[PDB]
Amino acid sequence: TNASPFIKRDRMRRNFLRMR
Amino acid sequence: FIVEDDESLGHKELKVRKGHIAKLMATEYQDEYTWSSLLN
């Protein structure tokens, strides 16, 4: 499992920049 | 967080979805949703 000990935010911003 | 019991996708779900929170993220990094503009 990955279990999420830490997280990222602006990478997911850029992912939604390509998604939209 | 509100929940509608019924759902076309089936069992039970809270109403808010990924697109709304994406729009919130976009408005925050804009630097036009608000908390009120989600409330309305």
mmCIF file of C-alpha atoms in Angstrom:
data_model
loop_
_atom_site.group_PDB
_atom_site.id
_atom_site.type_symbol
_atom_site.label_atom_id
_atom_site.label_comp_id
_atom_site.label_asym_id
_atom_site.label_seq_id
_atom_site.Cartn_x
_atom_site.Cartn_y
_atom_site.Cartn_z
ATOM 1 C CA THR A 1 0.000 0.000 0.000
ATOM 2 C CA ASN A 2 0.930 3.669 -0.333
ATOM 3 C CA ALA A 3 -0.692 4.700 3.008
ATOM 4 C CA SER A 4 -0.145 8.462 2.237
ATOM 5 C CA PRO A 5 2.423 9.638 4.837
ATOM 6 C CA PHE A 6 2.895 12.881 2.838
ATOM 7 C CA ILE A 7 1.099 14.673 -0.025
ATOM 8 C CA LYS A 8 1.583 17.043 -2.995
ATOM 9 C CA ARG A 9 -0.615 19.927 -4.191
ATOM 10 C CA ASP A 10 0.675 22.053 -7.104
ATOM 11 C CA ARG A 11 1.517 18.941 -9.113
ATOM 12 C CA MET A 12 -2.185 18.088 -8.923
ATOM 13 C CA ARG A 13 -2.929 21.696 -9.935
ATOM 14 C CA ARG A 14 -0.916 21.113 -13.100
ATOM 15 C CA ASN A 15 -2.647 17.752 -13.599
ATOM 16 C CA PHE A 16 -5.979 19.581 -13.622
ATOM 17 C CA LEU A 17 -4.452 22.192 -15.955
ATOM 18 C CA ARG A 18 -4.031 19.377 -18.457
ATOM 19 C CA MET A 19 -7.376 17.799 -17.467
ATOM 20 C CA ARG A 20 -9.417 20.964 -18.094
ATOM 21 C CA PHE B 1 -21.352 17.953 4.270
ATOM 22 C CA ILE B 2 -24.800 17.190 2.896
ATOM 23 C CA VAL B 3 -25.850 13.739 1.699
ATOM 24 C CA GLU B 4 -28.644 12.658 -0.582
ATOM 25 C CA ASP B 5 -29.732 9.129 0.253
ATOM 26 C CA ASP B 6 -30.900 8.280 -3.257
ATOM 27 C CA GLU B 7 -28.428 8.005 -6.121
ATOM 28 C CA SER B 8 -28.571 6.995 -9.777
ATOM 29 C CA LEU B 9 -25.106 5.531 -9.219
ATOM 30 C CA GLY B 10 -26.713 3.507 -6.462
ATOM 31 C CA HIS B 11 -26.365 3.269 -2.724
ATOM 32 C CA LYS B 12 -25.846 6.657 -0.934
ATOM 33 C CA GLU B 13 -23.596 9.622 -1.517
ATOM 34 C CA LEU B 14 -22.564 13.054 -0.412
ATOM 35 C CA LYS B 15 -23.519 15.540 -3.090
ATOM 36 C CA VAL B 16 -20.197 17.341 -3.604
ATOM 37 C CA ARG B 17 -17.880 16.021 -6.309
ATOM 38 C CA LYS B 18 -14.329 16.345 -7.588
ATOM 39 C CA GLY B 19 -15.159 19.093 -10.072
ATOM 40 C CA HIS B 20 -16.395 21.495 -7.416
ATOM 41 C CA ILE B 21 -13.293 21.112 -5.297
ATOM 42 C CA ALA B 22 -11.205 21.451 -8.442
ATOM 43 C CA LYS B 23 -12.908 24.782 -9.081
ATOM 44 C CA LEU B 24 -12.164 25.751 -5.480
ATOM 45 C CA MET B 25 -8.506 24.878 -5.996
ATOM 46 C CA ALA B 26 -8.476 26.967 -9.161
ATOM 47 C CA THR B 27 -10.053 29.946 -7.426
ATOM 48 C CA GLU B 28 -7.543 29.728 -4.597
ATOM 49 C CA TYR B 29 -4.590 29.632 -6.985
ATOM 50 C CA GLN B 30 -6.162 32.436 -9.026
ATOM 51 C CA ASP B 31 -4.533 34.765 -6.455
ATOM 52 C CA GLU B 32 -14.682 32.971 -8.560
ATOM 53 C CA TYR B 33 -16.012 30.574 -5.944
ATOM 54 C CA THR B 34 -16.170 31.505 -2.288
ATOM 55 C CA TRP B 35 -17.434 29.602 0.700
ATOM 56 C CA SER B 36 -20.669 31.545 0.250
ATOM 57 C CA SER B 37 -20.590 30.823 -3.465
ATOM 58 C CA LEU B 38 -20.539 27.169 -2.533
ATOM 59 C CA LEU B 39 -23.269 27.710 0.043
ATOM 60 C CA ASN B 40 -25.779 29.284 -2.313
#
